[PDB]
Design an enzyme around this catalytic site. Structure first.
Site, PDB file in Angstrom:
ATOM      1  N   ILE A 188      -3.801 -32.421 -15.105  1.00 27.67           N
ATOM      2  CA  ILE A 188      -3.499 -32.072 -16.349  1.00 27.67           C
ATOM      3  C   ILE A 188      -4.136 -32.380 -17.932  1.00 27.67           C
ATOM      4  O   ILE A 188      -4.575 -30.665 -18.010  1.00 27.67           O
ATOM      5  CB  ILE A 188      -1.885 -32.163 -16.884  1.00 27.67           C
ATOM      6  CG1 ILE A 188      -1.134 -31.429 -15.245  1.00 27.67           C
ATOM      7  CG2 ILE A 188      -1.775 -30.923 -17.856  1.00 27.67           C
ATOM      8  CD1 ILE A 188       0.833 -31.142 -16.105  1.00 27.67           C
ATOM      9  N   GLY A 189      -4.098 -33.206 -17.926  1.00 26.98           N
ATOM     10  CA  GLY A 189      -5.574 -33.780 -18.973  1.00 26.98           C
ATOM     11  C   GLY A 189      -4.689 -35.288 -19.373  1.00 26.98           C
ATOM     12  O   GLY A 189      -4.744 -36.140 -18.570  1.00 26.98           O
ATOM     13  N   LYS A 190      -5.821 -35.606 -20.709  1.00 25.42           N
ATOM     14  CA  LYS A 190      -6.247 -36.535 -20.679  1.00 25.42           C
ATOM     15  C   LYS A 190      -5.949 -37.062 -22.305  1.00 25.42           C
ATOM     16  O   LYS A 190      -5.939 -35.719 -23.418  1.00 25.42           O
ATOM     17  CB  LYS A 190      -7.863 -37.232 -20.810  1.00 25.42           C
ATOM     18  CG  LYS A 190      -8.448 -36.566 -19.244  1.00 25.42           C
ATOM     19  CD  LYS A 190      -9.620 -36.985 -19.240  1.00 25.42           C
ATOM     20  CE  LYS A 190      -9.871 -38.612 -18.178  1.00 25.42           C
ATOM     21  NZ  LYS A 190     -10.978 -37.910 -17.277  1.00 25.42           N
ATOM     22  N   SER A 219      -5.139 -40.015 -25.281  1.00 19.68           N
ATOM     23  CA  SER A 219      -6.190 -40.983 -25.591  1.00 19.68           C
ATOM     24  C   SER A 219      -4.621 -42.942 -24.508  1.00 19.68           C
ATOM     25  O   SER A 219      -5.250 -43.477 -24.588  1.00 19.68           O
ATOM     26  CB  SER A 219      -5.323 -41.944 -26.940  1.00 19.68           C
ATOM     27  OG  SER A 219      -3.518 -42.110 -27.654  1.00 19.68           O
ATOM     28  N   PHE A 220      -3.744 -42.250 -24.619  1.00 15.78           N
ATOM     29  CA  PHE A 220      -2.957 -42.989 -23.705  1.00 15.78           C
ATOM     30  C   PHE A 220      -3.362 -42.989 -22.195  1.00 15.78           C
ATOM     31  O   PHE A 220      -3.471 -44.699 -21.237  1.00 15.78           O
ATOM     32  CB  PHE A 220      -1.550 -42.491 -23.455  1.00 15.78           C
ATOM     33  CG  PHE A 220      -1.333 -41.038 -23.386  1.00 15.78           C
ATOM     34  CD1 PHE A 220      -1.221 -41.250 -22.043  1.00 15.78           C
ATOM     35  CD2 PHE A 220      -1.330 -40.331 -24.103  1.00 15.78           C
ATOM     36  CE1 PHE A 220      -1.286 -39.580 -21.433  1.00 15.78           C
ATOM     37  CE2 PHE A 220      -0.959 -38.993 -23.635  1.00 15.78           C
ATOM     38  CZ  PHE A 220      -0.950 -38.320 -22.252  1.00 15.78           C
ATOM     39  N   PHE A 258       7.998 -37.479 -15.911  1.00 12.63           N
ATOM     40  CA  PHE A 258       8.403 -36.616 -16.736  1.00 12.63           C
ATOM     41  C   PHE A 258       8.807 -35.100 -15.762  1.00 12.63           C
ATOM     42  O   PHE A 258       8.268 -34.657 -14.766  1.00 12.63           O
ATOM     43  CB  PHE A 258       7.913 -35.898 -17.580  1.00 12.63           C
ATOM     44  CG  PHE A 258       7.721 -37.350 -18.519  1.00 12.63           C
ATOM     45  CD1 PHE A 258       8.655 -37.692 -19.379  1.00 12.63           C
ATOM     46  CD2 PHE A 258       6.463 -37.848 -18.722  1.00 12.63           C
ATOM     47  CE1 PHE A 258       8.873 -39.125 -20.536  1.00 12.63           C
ATOM     48  CE2 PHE A 258       6.279 -39.667 -20.288  1.00 12.63           C
ATOM     49  CZ  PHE A 258       7.335 -39.355 -20.480  1.00 12.63           C
ATOM     50  N   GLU A 259      10.088 -34.836 -16.625  1.00  7.37           N
ATOM     51  CA  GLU A 259       9.983 -33.037 -15.886  1.00  7.37           C
ATOM     52  C   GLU A 259       8.575 -32.465 -16.804  1.00  7.37           C
ATOM     53  O   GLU A 259       8.242 -32.938 -17.040  1.00  7.37           O
ATOM     54  CB  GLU A 259      11.387 -32.368 -16.985  1.00  7.37           C
ATOM     55  CG  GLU A 259      10.837 -32.473 -18.029  1.00  7.37           C
ATOM     56  CD  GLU A 259      12.567 -32.165 -19.013  1.00  7.37           C
ATOM     57  OE1 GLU A 259      12.795 -30.915 -17.932  1.00  7.37           O
ATOM     58  OE2 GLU A 259      12.140 -32.788 -19.993  1.00  7.37           O
ATOM     59  N   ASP A 304       4.226 -39.298 -34.210  1.00  8.96           N
ATOM     60  CA  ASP A 304       3.524 -38.411 -34.087  1.00  8.96           C
ATOM     61  C   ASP A 304       3.496 -36.808 -33.890  1.00  8.96           C
ATOM     62  O   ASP A 304       3.578 -36.383 -32.976  1.00  8.96           O
ATOM     63  CB  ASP A 304       2.185 -38.813 -33.117  1.00  8.96           C
ATOM     64  CG  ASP A 304       1.104 -39.114 -32.760  1.00  8.96           C
ATOM     65  OD1 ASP A 304       0.975 -38.313 -33.970  1.00  8.96           O
ATOM     66  OD2 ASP A 304       0.750 -39.332 -31.853  1.00  8.96           O
TER      67      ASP A 304
HETATM   68  F1  LIG Z   1      -3.270 -33.359 -22.563  1.00  3.75           F
HETATM   69  C1  LIG Z   1      -1.709 -34.619 -21.536  1.00  3.75           C
HETATM   70  F2  LIG Z   1      -1.450 -34.919 -22.347  1.00  3.75           F
HETATM   71  F3  LIG Z   1      -2.771 -35.491 -21.140  1.00  3.75           F
HETATM   72  O1  LIG Z   1      -1.817 -33.407 -21.223  1.00  3.75           O
HETATM   73  C2  LIG Z   1      -0.926 -33.059 -20.502  1.00  3.75           C
HETATM   74  C3  LIG Z   1      -1.125 -31.617 -21.223  1.00  3.75           C
HETATM   75  C4  LIG Z   1      -0.439 -29.936 -21.261  1.00  3.75           C
HETATM   76  C5  LIG Z   1       0.527 -30.704 -21.007  1.00  3.75           C
HETATM   77  C6  LIG Z   1       1.229 -31.337 -19.677  1.00  3.75           C
HETATM   78  C7  LIG Z   1       2.610 -31.684 -20.001  1.00  3.75           C
HETATM   79  C8  LIG Z   1       3.243 -30.555 -18.588  1.00  3.75           C
HETATM   80  N1  LIG Z   1       4.324 -31.005 -18.403  1.00  3.75           N
HETATM   81  C9  LIG Z   1       4.701 -32.522 -19.163  1.00  3.75           C
HETATM   82  C10 LIG Z   1       5.960 -33.483 -19.453  1.00  3.75           C
HETATM   83  C11 LIG Z   1       5.484 -34.932 -20.082  1.00  3.75           C
HETATM   84  C12 LIG Z   1       4.420 -34.800 -20.945  1.00  3.75           C
HETATM   85  C13 LIG Z   1       3.219 -35.699 -21.646  1.00  3.75           C
HETATM   86  C14 LIG Z   1       4.961 -36.763 -21.381  1.00  3.75           C
HETATM   87  C15 LIG Z   1       4.740 -38.090 -22.834  1.00  3.75           C
HETATM   88  N2  LIG Z   1       3.479 -38.150 -23.147  1.00  3.75           N
HETATM   89  C16 LIG Z   1       2.691 -37.353 -22.875  1.00  3.75           C
HETATM   90  C17 LIG Z   1       3.185 -36.288 -22.264  1.00  3.75           C
HETATM   91  N3  LIG Z   1       2.834 -34.396 -20.337  1.00  3.75           N
HETATM   92  N4  LIG Z   1       3.350 -32.313 -19.726  1.00  3.75           N
HETATM   93  C18 LIG Z   1       0.042 -32.532 -19.684  1.00  3.75           C
END
Ligand SMILES: FC(F)(F)Oc1cccc(-c2cnc3ccc(-c4ccncc4)nn23)c1
Ligand SMILES: [Cl-]
Length: 344
Positions: free
Chosen positions: A32-34, A36-37, A105-106, A154
């Protein structure tokens, strides 16, 4: 073998391969994406039969430690938010996989920065902004629960996710920088555009720094652009002072980093240090005009449009100004933000 048996890249990320099956359970669909973590991955949980988002943490001690804090904070939230009516992304479980901590995560949709880009940075409507504001105040109320007292640290548009592109529901994500009241106090926390004056001034801080961020986020969501886009801390402080004026003398007197942005004249008054870039005089970039209260919204893009009355903007500006109170002791708190007339 080196690079975690060839499983990791140069940045300690796991090299994601579509269709891989983890723990004979998660079918990885795609990246889905990147951040820093590490990375977030779209997957199908064969056991529960649902799509999930799996956050794959970088294989590095520093990032693993942050994820361990995030897990502890989300698990403590789950103990108080079992109905999930409070707007925080829900952690289902976690596991270790090929030396990577994975948080399940959901699955949500894309973030509020992406929503602005789909708008070509013209902003979302005031009605949608109000809905976003109401849900984030409810989330901040939930985090202020005394047994939690969690500071996100943040909040920004990329840390707020839509549940679904066709709905107004949002959730806060990513508690890797977060903490509870009474832990370590840091310099340089919060993303710079959203960093509170307390944190810039090196002062002690509490849950009010999230309210400061919220105020900046909401204006951005309607204007399309950051309210305070500092290139560095001095530029950041100066851009805040353009809109809100010089901080109160009683706060600057107590601020360990005051002399990094301000000086005292012989008479005792506090003034901006001069560093080139020249700024509007303090308090002259009026938020009344950034929102275009009497002139059709930001840039006039709301002229002639319903749900954008002058009274709506005056209520919005009033709520924003309470969120951007310089004094964290009087900055509006979530419970009272929710009683503001902007929501009535
Ligand atoms: F940009 C990145 F996060 F890398 O990739 C992305 C970019 C756009 C959406 C999501 C996405 C869709 N559904 C979820 C559920 C949880 C989380 C999340 C939880 C904790 N910490 C960070 C993210 N992300 N998430 C992740
Ligand atoms: Cl104003």
């Amino acid at each position: 073998k080196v690079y975690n048996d060839g499983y990791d890249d140069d940045n300690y990320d796991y090299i994601v391969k579509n269709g891989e099956k983890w723990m004979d359970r998660y079918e990885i669909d795609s990246l889905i994406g990147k951040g820093s973590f590490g990375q977030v991955v779209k997957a199908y949980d064969r056991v529960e039969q649902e799509w999930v988002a799996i956050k794959i943490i970088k294989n590095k001690k520093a990032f693993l430690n942050q994820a361990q804090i995030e897990v502890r904070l989300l698990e403590l939230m789950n103990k108080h938010d079992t109905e999930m009516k409070y707007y925080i992304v829900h952690l289902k479980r976690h596991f270790m996989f090929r030396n990577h901590l994975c948080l399940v995560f959901e699955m949500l949709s894309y973030n509020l920065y992406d929503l602005l880009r789909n708008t070509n940075f013209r902003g979302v409507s005031l009605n949608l902004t109000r809905k976003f504001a109401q849900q984030m105040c409810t989330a901040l109320l939930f985090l202020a629960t005394p047994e939690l007292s969690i500071i996100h640290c943040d909040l920004k548009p990329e840390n707020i996710l839509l549940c679904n592109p066709k709905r107004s529901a949002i959730k806060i994500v990513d508690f890797g920088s977060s903490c509870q009241l009474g832990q370590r106090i840091y310099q340089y926390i919060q993303s710079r555009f959203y960093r509170s004056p307390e944190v810039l001034l090196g002062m002690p801080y509490d849950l009010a720094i999230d309210m400061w961020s919220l105020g900046c986020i909401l204006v951005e969501m309607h204007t399309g652009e950051p309210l305070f886009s500092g290139a560095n801390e001095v530029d950041q402080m100066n851009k805040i002072v353009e809109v809100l004026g010089i901080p109160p003398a009683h706060i600057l007197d107590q601020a360990p980093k005051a002399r990094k942005f301000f000086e005292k004249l012989p008479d005792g008054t506090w003034n901006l240090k001069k560093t080139k870039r020249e700024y509007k005089p303090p308090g002259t970039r009026k938020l009344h005009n950034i929102l275009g209260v009497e002139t059709g919204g930001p840039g006039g893009r709301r002229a002639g449009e319903s749900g954008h009355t002058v009274a709506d903007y005056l209520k919005f500006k009033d709520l924003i100004l309470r969120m951007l109170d310089y004094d964290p002791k009087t900055r509006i708190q979530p419970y009272y933000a929710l009683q503001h007339s902007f929501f009535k």
